[PDB]
Amino acid sequence: MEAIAKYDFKATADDELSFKRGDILKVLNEECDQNWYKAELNGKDGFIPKNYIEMKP
């Protein structure tokens, strides 16, 4: 699936990865959390918040 960064984001921990308002993310895993997504960016893979992005099937 596709993901779209809506706001700027700077990780908080090792299991999270950054982006900047506009990144096109690769939606890999998703443990049905209702607050986060596991996606690929910039040569890394990590958690990103749902309210900071928008999904696009």
Binding site: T12, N35, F47, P49, N51, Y52
Partner: peptide, 10 residues
């Protein structure tokens, strides 16, 4: 001003 981030780990 972006949203309040969610508490991780549910």
């Amino acid at each position: 001003v972006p949203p309040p981030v969610p508490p991780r780990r549910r």
